[PDB]
Amino acid sequence: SGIVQQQNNLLRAIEAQQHLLQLTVWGIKQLQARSGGRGGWMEWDREINNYTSLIHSLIEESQNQQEK
């Protein structure tokens, strides 16, 4: 009964979610913190970086490109 509806919504749906992308990421934060919990997450949020650049220099610097 809505052979066209879905067809037209499929193409619109794509763009019809550009807002939810930020709201979904912000909704999880404002929500999780909505509780009266007393935990620390910042800590591990710093070290996770040290393991990020240690592997990025080994790869990028190792994998060289020119003419292959």
DSSP structure class, residue 18: T
User: In angstroms, rounded to a whole number, what is the distance separating the alpha carbons of residues 13 and 6?
Assistant: 9
**Elucidation method:** NMR
DSSP structure class, residue 66: S
Amino acid at 35: S
Amino acid at 1: S
User: In angstroms, rounded to a whole number, what is the distance separating the alpha carbons of residues 9 and 43?
Assistant: 44
Q: For the domain made up of 1-68, give the CATH fold.
A: Helix Hairpins (1.10.287)
Retrieve residue 22's tokens.
């930020």
